[PDB]
Write a protein that binds this ligand. Sequence first.
Ligand SMILES: Nc1ncnc2c1ncn2[C@@H]1O[C@H](COP(=O)(O)OP(=O)(O)OP(O)(O)=S)[C@@H](O)[C@H]1O
Ligand SMILES: Nc1ncnc2c1ncn2[C@@H]1O[C@H](COP(=O)(O)OP(=O)(O)OP(O)(O)=S)[C@@H](O)[C@H]1O
Ligand SMILES: [Mg+2]
Ligand SMILES: [Mg+2]
Lengths: 258, 257, 254, 396, 320
Amino acid sequence: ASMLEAKFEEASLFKRIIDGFKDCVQLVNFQCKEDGIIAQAVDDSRVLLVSLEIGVEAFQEYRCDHPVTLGMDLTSLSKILRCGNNTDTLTLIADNTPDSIILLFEDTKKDRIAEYSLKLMDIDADFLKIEELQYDSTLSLPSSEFSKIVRDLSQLSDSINIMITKETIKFVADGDIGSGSVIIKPFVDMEHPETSIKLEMDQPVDLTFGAKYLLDIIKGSSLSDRVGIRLSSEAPALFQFDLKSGFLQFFLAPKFND
Amino acid sequence: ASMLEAKFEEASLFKRIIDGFKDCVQLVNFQCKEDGIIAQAVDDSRVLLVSLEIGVEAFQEYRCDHPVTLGMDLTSLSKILRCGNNTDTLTLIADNTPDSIILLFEDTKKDRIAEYSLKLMDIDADFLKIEELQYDSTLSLPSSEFSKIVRDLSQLSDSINIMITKETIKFVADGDIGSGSVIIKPFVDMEHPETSIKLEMDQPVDLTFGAKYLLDIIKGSSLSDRVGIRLSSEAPALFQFDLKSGFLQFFLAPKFN
Amino acid sequence: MLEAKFEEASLFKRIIDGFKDCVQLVNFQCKEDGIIAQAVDDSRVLLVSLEIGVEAFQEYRCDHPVTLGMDLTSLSKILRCGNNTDTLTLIADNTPDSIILLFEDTKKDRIAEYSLKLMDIDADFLKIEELQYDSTLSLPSSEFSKIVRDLSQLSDSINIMITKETIKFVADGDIGSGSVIIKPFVDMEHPETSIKLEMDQPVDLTFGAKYLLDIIKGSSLSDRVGIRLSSEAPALFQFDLKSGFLQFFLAPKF
Amino acid sequence: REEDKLWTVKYAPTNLQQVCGNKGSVMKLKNWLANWENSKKNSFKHAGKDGSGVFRAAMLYGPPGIGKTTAAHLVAQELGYDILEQNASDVRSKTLLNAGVKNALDNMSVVGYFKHQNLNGKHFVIIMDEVDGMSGGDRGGVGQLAQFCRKTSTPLILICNERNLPKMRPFDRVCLDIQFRRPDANSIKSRLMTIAIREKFKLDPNVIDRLIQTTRGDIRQVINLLSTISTTTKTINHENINEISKAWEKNIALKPFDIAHKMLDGQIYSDIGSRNFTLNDKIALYFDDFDFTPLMIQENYLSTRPSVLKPGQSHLEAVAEAANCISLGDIVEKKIRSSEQLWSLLPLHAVLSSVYPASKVAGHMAGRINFTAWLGQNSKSAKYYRLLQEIHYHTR
Amino acid sequence: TLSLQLPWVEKYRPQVLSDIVGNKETIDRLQQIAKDGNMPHMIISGMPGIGKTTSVHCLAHELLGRSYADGVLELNASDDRGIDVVRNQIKHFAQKKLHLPPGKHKIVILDEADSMTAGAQQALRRTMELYSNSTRFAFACNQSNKIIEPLQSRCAILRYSKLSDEDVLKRLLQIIKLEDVKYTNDGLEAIIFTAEGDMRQAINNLQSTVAGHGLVNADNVFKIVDSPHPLIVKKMLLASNLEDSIQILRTDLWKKGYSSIDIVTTSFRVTKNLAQVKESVRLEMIKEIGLTHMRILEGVGTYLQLASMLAKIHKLNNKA
DNA sequence: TTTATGTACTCGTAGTGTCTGC
DNA sequence: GCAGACACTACGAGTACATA
Ligand SMILES: Nc1ncnc2c1ncn2[C@@H]1O[C@H](COP(=O)(O)OP(=O)(O)OP(O)(O)=S)[C@@H](O)[C@H]1O
Ligand SMILES: Nc1ncnc2c1ncn2[C@@H]1O[C@H](COP(=O)(O)OP(=O)(O)OP(O)(O)=S)[C@@H](O)[C@H]1O
Ligand SMILES: [Mg+2]
Ligand SMILES: [Mg+2]
């Protein structure tokens, strides 16, 4: 019996998590333990971090006897994920001291089980845990609105300045061809609570971010309908996308100001 | 509270108008007067003259203090214009001797406001005093049908030989790969008059046009259901799209005969 | 002396879309019973043959067999001009150096007539080798297309192996490996989607990924693709049409 | 708004007699452009003594800053034609040129309708500047321009710098060959006297010859030079002329003939010449045209009467010494252009192929510099090879 | 992680045209352009570190004190200086309507324009010819040979020259008065000799010496920075008595960890720029050093190859 | 018709994905 | 809902330079 046996319901899920950070990160590793399959990787430019956690609730049946590390190339993994249909059920299968995993695409509607194997990799990146817990501004806005804002402000310039005020969120994207200023205020939509925007302001925040990495952040807006930005000075921004059992939280380093 | 407060009531109309002639010309001068907004542009090949005029009735609230030139690049304008919604109401604003203009995208919900500044480009373009002359023939057909026919013929040759003789429009095209021809008959549709073909015969015509120029003209076919084309033997063609309170008329010069 | 008036130009459109990339120059040896054509790629490894009978045509009249050497890019442009509700009318003369493709609509609002010349392409050698094929399977074209695309992502050499009613498309590359097996599923409510196999003798054939991806473009012709394999004869991927069929001949590449 | 424009635009030729220098080129261009109508009705078959009838298009070439663009624009504007200027800032690849002015070659203007006696106001003149800026080569627009020259219904004017590019070959005789030269000192002198009167700065009538010869006849840099000098010191005389010359020498990259001509001079290798023209200067002279210089030295390293012979050394001995180093530098060139691609040996190749071989055969010449003949004989040898492997394939 | 003090290179970077010391005529011309306003297109060229881009930045600051952030475009090799980006950005900047003061024009600064592609320069030619009454270009390249001829035709060439030791000494004393530090005149002379006209090198050496020891003395300076290899190589080549050159090599280049390729290339450069000896001996020496360079690049890198090169050079010197 | 790898640039190309409206 | 229409990143092929 294979020691790692993780079953995915609605196998389009794992494809969505993989596509969430396929573009920004090229090399990841999955510390699979009894609690769940967590991951953490840093880009080649050492600007953006991608933490990840998938709880046992998201799996139909999860069993991981010993801690497993699965260093992987995200391009090949995403290609393997694209080799299937959302109707099929995906399973991760790994033996003791794994050289590769086994991915199964099974479905009872039609017996067309496809077994793929992806070669592992020795990343040897020990990293460290997150040591940021206190943030000044904690705001949550719908993922579609934030993705739209980032998309139409990235065309003007390469730097997007997010400013936080008393019940006022401001995005400034001054550039060569012009400028931009998106001002959105908190409101509670009773009819559609998912479209509401919340704000919790403690200390004023004024941080600028790169456009390309912020686009990479919003590329994960298909994963969850709401994103909670937690800004703070002298602290990376935390864009957390909630899952059914875990989360996909990003850490982005603000640009220097001089 | 400035010189110009031209406020479109529905922004996608302005987006369609700008996208109507986005590719053919890049630099355009927007003359803003009390009667309305009139714009004239000259193509890089000096064959296309995209004359534009928007009346005060099109704007929900048009208030121009005094006449002024607004020269802006169409690429930056199209980049900025992709920042709004269908319910968004454009609120273009210019100040005294403007170096930049604020495109305030207001919303029905008051907690969503987005203002964009656009840097004005200094353009030296001499004004063209067009004149009203009688053309040999005036053809009016639906813009969708005309666009379909011309995109059909442009996949065969770089030139189109428009012919109007014996109340029979004779769109033809001959190229290296082959030769194409389309014949239509003017009629009246009782079910939907906007799908009919209307033509008046004054003199015969012998006119020839290119392919990419006509594609750039039909790129703006979304504004009007039907296009009014007037043909003269020794005068430029006038492809005219009627707007709700204005028009977008193209002046395309026929080739040598 | 040719008058082949289709009832819908979309048939001819999807046929030419099927063989855009496998071959560029084709000689239309039209006959009374229909149109047949044979074509060989530049690599001399892929063979495509098309056949459309008169039963598909609303009208057809070909008294004299004429070999028509005709470009496919021009046909693609002319048939992208065409659309639904328009009845394409293939018309040729007694000595048709230029062809005519009349597009006739239901209404007289706009009727279009087109032309295209006939280039000189030598008549391809009509090899009629029909050696028996060891195993025969037929699966829906969408399933086969998905399988071949996903396995060609991994590697450039897809192995096809048939044994014990379980077809095992295995492609092994550098990023990993890929193995899909198909059981002979039978369906009652939807007989079109089924997998049936006639395994007379096991075969193990390897094909290149480029040609296996190229032959997919004919998936619009048929909802089902019939594949018959022989240990030494070229594989036969056949696409069912209303009247005739279009077939692909690719020799095994061990 | 004046007194902010450049001196090269405010003091620009407005009419045709303000273009100082190259009067013959301007009048020939005007004569060609004024008789294109009857030539068009003559089906470009019959031409006069000048041949303007059979030349459908005329191209302009010469050194910068002499008035090609200005003269072309004045001729186009004067005769009522509508200007249509192109440039390298607008991409002119196959796609953007086939979808560019290809339609406008057989089409008439639209702005001429509302601007109108003028009989040529409904026509186009294609002023294609910066055609040397298009380095596309194959499928880079040069073949498209050749096709345009073959078939255009409007006058076509091209402006470039010089013709010795292999890229510029397809325009050997399909286009008219009017050429501009360096303007004479008298016309420039009168123009600069007018400039000095207008800008109230002192300009001696004798320093102007040195100002022209330093700038190599480039009038635009001359006007810029006088402007920037007169900014802080508007009076120039014999005292500052040497400093101005040494600070504003033009420093043109030399022509492949000129590198060999300068390198074969015996004056530079003398004791006085070595001090004035250092070895680093000779290395830079080689690196000016490092592709053709090693050959161009070799084809005529023996056609020079020597002047640097060592006492007791014959001319043939010096030629043999030069040939030995040519052979030595051949190996260095092979090692540079090999699998390893050791491109740090180029300064070695300079000395081993051009400096040393010319250091033994310097002096006055027997004849004019002979172009590299190795290229043509290499082509003929390659054709002979191809024939031999062809007959070897056929004979088996 | 500790913080870092701002380096003296830009902590004392000049901000006024009177601060930079160098070619007096050039700086006076720049000041005259500053007072007048009508700046022409200029191409500033010279050796590295002699104050080229700082003069351009100071001139632009003086000309556009209030509108520097709006009407000055700064591009360099770090930006995507290609035909598409040059076309789009430079044409958007050159047509932008900005109401400058009557004597002030937009300034487009192109740092290190030598590494810029030919087609981009061809587009720049046309852009300069169109837009010259609103925007003025300003290049700053180490060598002006890379820039095409028409661009130099339409610009105003302004070349810098290596600073004399007096100007470097004056700037060094100015900085030493600005920040307190104990110095010895021998240390300052050693720093100036090591700099060889490069002011930035002098500032870096001074800062390194002050941080390492705290006293600007000759021994401290020679400890922080070694003697330049061109000088020791020139001493090796010029010296006769072959054994002396052999021991100079083995002591000051081999045991000091200098690669053989570096020694051979430095010898080539020194014997190319040498002036004490006649032309023919320089040519022969270049030939022999090139043979040794070929041997080294082929892979045979040892002490004996350099010793043989010196032996051949000395056999040449004694005229066989 | 020449060199002969690696690099950088430039272009047109074919897929790829997202938004409009029949 | 499906088919188009768009803009988008991506891949392929060709020119050009290679030390001051
Ligand atoms: N014959 C002339 N007499 C006086 N000034 C002249 C003359 N020719 C050119 N100029 C000056 O040069 C400016 C522009 O010359 P152009 O013809 O544009 O240079 P060019 O010949 O195009 O060289 P390029 O394009 O830079 S390679 C004019 O505005 C004048 O200031
Ligand atoms: N004339 C000068 N007066 C004062 N400081 C100077 C002078 N020239 C250079 N510097 C100093 O040198 C530094 C600036 O050097 P840069 O001008 O950036 O070098 P550069 O001229 O740009 O040469 P490159 O090609 O960029 S390496 C600062 O630390 C200045 O203080
Ligand atoms: Mg010119
Ligand atoms: Mg610099």
